[PDB]
Amino acid sequence: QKIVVHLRATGGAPILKQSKFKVSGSDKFANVIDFLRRQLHSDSLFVYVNSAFSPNPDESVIDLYNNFGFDGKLVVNYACSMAW
Amino acid sequence: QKIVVHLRATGGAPILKQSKFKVSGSDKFANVIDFLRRQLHSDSLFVYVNSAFSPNPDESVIDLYNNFGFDGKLVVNYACSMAW
Known part of the structure; x- marks a missing residue:
């Protein structure tokens, strides 16, 4: 199974x-961390998920x-199902 | 003081x-929860923050x-210095 990963700065x-x-x-996940470390040339990047x-x-x-x-506001999400 | 709340479905x-x-x-926060449950007619709506x-x-x-x-992907955020 291939998972789509989007990197967001x-x-x-x-x-x-x-x-x-x-x-x-x-x-x-070490692979993702290592890819970013190489692209940005840093060994101390913050790599996180919401x-x-x-x-x-x-x-x-x-x-x-x-x-x-x-950015001056609090985002509050609401949903029927958490699995879209 | 007034806070801007962005509601996202x-x-x-x-x-x-x-x-x-x-x-x-x-x-x-109960006021925000109650507002959504009342206006959208549901007692089981998920109301969350990230x-x-x-x-x-x-x-x-x-x-x-x-x-x-x-939405069909894993979003990986990254920063060299963190800011929400």
Whole structure:
């Protein structure tokens, strides 16, 4: 099984011309980390994936904004199914 | 203080014409949850925010994709210095 992997630059990191790849699902994530390390010429890159979670209803909006907001706003997603 | 909240529909949920709102930071997140459940007629809507984590080198691409993949792909964010 081949998985489509899209590399997304954040925090002002260099944008790669070739950001879309197809890789074997059995491949270890070390391969992705190593590819980026080589493309950007750095051994200390931040390589991460987003993870969804349902915020505590009792938490204030300002706190969630301070811990998860970006570019002046807090993005709140909503869905029927988490598997699209 | 007012916080801009960007509501985004995913996973089959109905899209709102105006999904951008100003909410008092002092309000509990419960107000956002209740707004969505009320306006979209569903008690079981997933209301989530995105967090982030760096996968371990030995993790397989397939598992990362099955666990956190989005719209037919695994999005890998990278930065030389982090900013949400």
